[PDB]
Design a protein around this ligand. Structure first.
Ligand SMILES: *[C@H](C)[C@H]1/C(=C/c2[nH]c(/C=C3N=C(/C=C4\NC(=O)C(CC)=C4C)C(C)=C\3CCC(=O)O)c(CCC(=O)O)c2C)NC(=O)[C@@H]1C
Length: 320
């Protein structure tokens, strides 16, 4: 309504921008049991230690990974619901470098985001997975244990639990006003950082396109706003840029990358606060770091279900 004069501003370059963040790599793979590579980020061979090259259009994507990894991929692709197995713990074929693989389906096939695992030891990997999930359930029960009719205390508790879970320098709750401008209504930050609590920002800083995408893609991580985006090489038969809207590694729009650089938020993690209207974006939990940061997928998943629990409790206290 207030941003009506923008139309669908930015939506095409956010959905199909052609670039990923360099901390990981992306593969698009045929969804017909051939595992043919349809597209790959130009850094894939480098990140997989693999410089007919194994990373080339039409090659078998399974041959990038260890033989036991290929079996997990075959299972995940054939599963009734691909999201249930995310993330896969898989190894590159030649170097045995471990990755979390996050799979999703698009128009043309399956996208695989590969995020390097910053531990080889499987047991410490499991210990990280486990601790996060149990931290989210603990956070959720602590939100359940909260005296009702106090949205401010709910927001102040959320920011403390998310800051302990994620380790970001600054964690905020950003609430959208009626006129679509926002306000920082709760903050937990490193004590040598200037507070943003109580600050108001124009509606135009978060365009309708971005607000809309947060309904389907509820958690977005940016590892380094200064990182050079990586282009996607695609099969010449694809008539438009790959859909990256569901990718964990989608590069920020250059206007946002510059916004983050000007704010000194080198890294961010942004999560949707969704309530019933059938669903409304009430606000965001916005995490900033003053250095690069890329937390493992299991911690981001644990945040996502904490945020579902926050939305439901918030939606109860609002209808009440
Ligand atoms: C470019 C001309 C204009 C513009 C575009 C733009 N913004 C976003 C998305 C976001 N903008 C913010 C804003 C804030 N972050 C903060 O820390 C604060 C203070 C609390 C504000 C107001 C946020 C949170 C997002 C979401 C980003 C994310 O997903 O992590 C986009 C979408 C970017 C994309 O790639 O998805 C775009 C295009 N921003 C401007 O300021 C210009 C007017």
């Amino acid at each position: 309504e207030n941003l009506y004069f923008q139309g669908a501003a930015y939506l095409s370059r956010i959905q199909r921008g052609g670039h990923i963040q360099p901390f990981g790599c992306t593969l698009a793979v045929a969804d017909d049991s051939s595992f043919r590579l349809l597209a790959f980020s130009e850094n894939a061979a480098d990140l997989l230690d693999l410089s007919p090259p194994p990373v080339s259009l039409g090659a078998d994507a399974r041959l990038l990974f260890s033989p036991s990894s290929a079996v997990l991929l075959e299972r995940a692709f054939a599963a009734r619901e691909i999201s249930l197995l995310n993330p896969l713990w898989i190894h590159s074929r030649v170097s045995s470098k471990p990755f979390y693989a996050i799979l999703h389906r698009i128009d043309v096939g399956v996208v695989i985001d590969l995020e390097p695992a910053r531990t080889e030891d499987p047991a410490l990997s499991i210990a990280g997975a486990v601790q996060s999930q149990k931290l989210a359930v603990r956070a959720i029960s602590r939100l359940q244990a909260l005296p009702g009719g106090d949205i401010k205390l709910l927001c102040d508790t959320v920011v403390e639990h998310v800051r302990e879970l994620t380790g970001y320098d600054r964690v905020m709750v950003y609430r959208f006003h009626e006129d679509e401008h926002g306000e920082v209504v709760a903050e937990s930050r490193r004590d040598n950082l200037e507070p943003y609590l109580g600050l108001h920002y124009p509606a135009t800083d978060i365009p309708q396109a971005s607000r809309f995408l947060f309904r389907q893609n509820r958690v977005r991580m940016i590892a380094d706003c200064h990182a050079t985006p990586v282009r996607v090489i695609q099969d010449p038969g694809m008539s438009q840029p790959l859909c990256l809207v569901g990718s964990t590694l989608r590069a920020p729009h250059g206007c946002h990358a510059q916004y983050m650089a000007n704010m000194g938020s080198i890294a961010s993690l942004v999560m949707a606060v969704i309530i019933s209207s059938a669903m409304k974006l009430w606000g965001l939990v916005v995490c900033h770091h003053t250095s690069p940061r890329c937390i493992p997928f299991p911690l981001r998943y644990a945040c996502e279900f904490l945020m579902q629990a926050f939305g439901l409790q918030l939606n109860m206290e609002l209808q009440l």
